[PDB]
Design a protein around this ligand. Structure first.
Ligand SMILES: [Zn+2]
Ligand SMILES: [Zn+2]
Ligand SMILES: [Zn+2]
Ligand SMILES: [Zn+2]
Lengths: 318, 337
């Protein structure tokens, strides 16, 4: 929503805004050019700037007016003498310095707050896409379980599962597929390796699908989470949600629960909010719920916050 | 880097980009590795649960942290902090508030080091290119009428991983028909039709190093214009590869291919640079373009990839990964053009 961006620009005294992060360029333009895409909001509205190699593709996809540049150096001329330039916190130091030296920009203000507030609430159209990515992720996890046998390498299972996801319409995996067996299960971010699975080992299967620009996330462990999903009644804070699962684990005597309970999922695999965080959970928010004890066990579902509750978008047996 | 720091009055350096962390430490921590150079001594900082693995592999002293916010304390009151140009605005502002009175770029020395590949580096790129070669051959054999572009990409990416690659170097391009007119036409749901030009652009990431190859085919027999454009791109590509040598600038190399395509009347349709550097990243220094004048030197690894793109009709691109040797250039990708 560009209307909310302009409204943010108005009450923070920002003249022009520059957006360069591919995910945010998509969110506001409807297209994401691989070789570079850049939005400038000049007061009232926005336009998409692309290199000539991306012009044709951006033209058929963008809801915004598209103009091509031969040199990136052209953008410094259009933003010349901007008093306050609204930028993403992720914008590189190089680019900031270039705006100061070549465009004579006088001050910079972080536009992160409005992008966070916009992207944190997913529309019905966004939820439909995420549900489809979750369906692909469901199929992939089931395929992984059927493929895990004696002597099989973690990476080989990962490859077949990622092949399955793409054959089912996913652009690519949402992240490096985690398949961790034996002592590797004790590691949370244990990306699949050359190590061979033996009988009696705990195999943590963690994967996601990127489908039509939206992500999914699922973890199953083969050889506490239910209560957290059941408790998420909007109006609740993110910390209070984390408290539920962490309390059960602490009550059993494993309070090993080293990472957070979850994270937001959308155009990126890890986004707002985190489940230290005290954001008020609202309907339309798409989050992850993943408790773990580290031997290693992790159970994770992508969950949608609905009116008076939360529902699982990933549907695989726990 | 230490020499750069002393010359530019840089008290401490902070390196955060994973590829640069790997380049200086010899290890790539799965969570978040960070290098802090204090004068003459470089130290690798890793999350507590990545300490063991980092200690086994790193060529630098390793110190663990529980939280990232500990880094702000270790760079307590450094006047001038040397940073990468890729470092985010948020992080620079964090160093201002939590820790720093001045910031200076260290990009020049990183570029100067990484642009020249060691013999060990070229060996890994060679294997990456062999995998990519096998993938493009598989792609060509896989492409038939009615096949979804994405399905072709799925198969060849699977084959790459089975051949030892960590993952594809970038999102595989299988661009057919009207899609071949788009240089970055990542494989889509589009079904390949008879008479389609099909651009196959892929690469492998193998043991931290990248490869890059493009081949173009026609489904069925090529028509007059398809053959016409193809031969011009082929000529441009061949003549550039033969001309690439030390002493020559990137601009001069780009010009070799650009002048040929312009000669045939397709100058307006060669809508990108001739190529780019390849190493720890798929796109690296130098850029082989009219705007880049870096002198090519021995040990540089670049691509040479001219193209002609006519919208709604299609396009042709042919790309090789090429090493700059003592007296010329050596093709690292070997499949027929
Ligand atoms: Zn996960
Ligand atoms: Zn997750
Ligand atoms: Zn290339
Ligand atoms: Zn390529």
């Amino acid at each position: 929503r560009l209307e909310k961006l302009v409204k943010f620009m108005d009450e923070n005294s920002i003249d022009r805004v520059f957006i360069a992060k591919p995910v945010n360029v998509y969110y506001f333009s409807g297209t994401s050019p691989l070789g570079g895409g850049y939005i400038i909001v000049d007061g009232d509205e926005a336009t998409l700037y692309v290199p000539e190699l991306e012009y044709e593709m951006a033209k058929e996809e963008s809801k915004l007016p598209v103009v091509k540049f031969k040199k990136f150096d052209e953008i410094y001329e259009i933003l010349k003498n901007t008093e306050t330039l609204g930028i993403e916190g992720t914008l590189s130091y190089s680019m900031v310095e270039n705006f100061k030296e070549k465009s004579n920009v006088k001050e910079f203000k972080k536009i992160d707050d409005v992008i966070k507030d916009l992207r944190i609430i997913k529309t019905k159209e966004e939820i439909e896409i995420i549900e489809k990515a979750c369906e692909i992720a469901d199929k992939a996890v089931m395929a992984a379980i059927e493929e895990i046998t004696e002597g099989k390498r973690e990476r080989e299972v990962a490859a077949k599962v990622e092949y399955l996801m793409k054959m089912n319409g996913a652009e690519k995996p949402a992240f490096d597929t985690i398949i961790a067996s034996g002592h590797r299960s004790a590691l949370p971010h244990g990306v699949a390796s050359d190590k061979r699975i033996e009988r009696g080992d705990l195999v943590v299967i963690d994967l996601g699908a990127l489908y039509n620009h939206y992500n999914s996330d699922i973890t199953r462990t083969i050889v506490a989470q239910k209560r957290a999903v059941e408790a998420a009644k909007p109006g609740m804070t993110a910390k209070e949600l984390d408290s539920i699962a962490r309390e059960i684990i602490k009550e059993y005597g494993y309070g090993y629960f080293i990472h957070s309970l979850g994270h937001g999922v959308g155009l990126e695999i890890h986004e707002w909010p985190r489940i230290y965080d005290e954001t008020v959970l609202k309907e339309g928010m798409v989050i992850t719920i993943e408790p773990g004890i580290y031997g290693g066990v992790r159970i994770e579902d992508t969950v949608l916050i609905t009116e008076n509750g939360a529902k699982r978008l990933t549907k695989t047996e726990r």
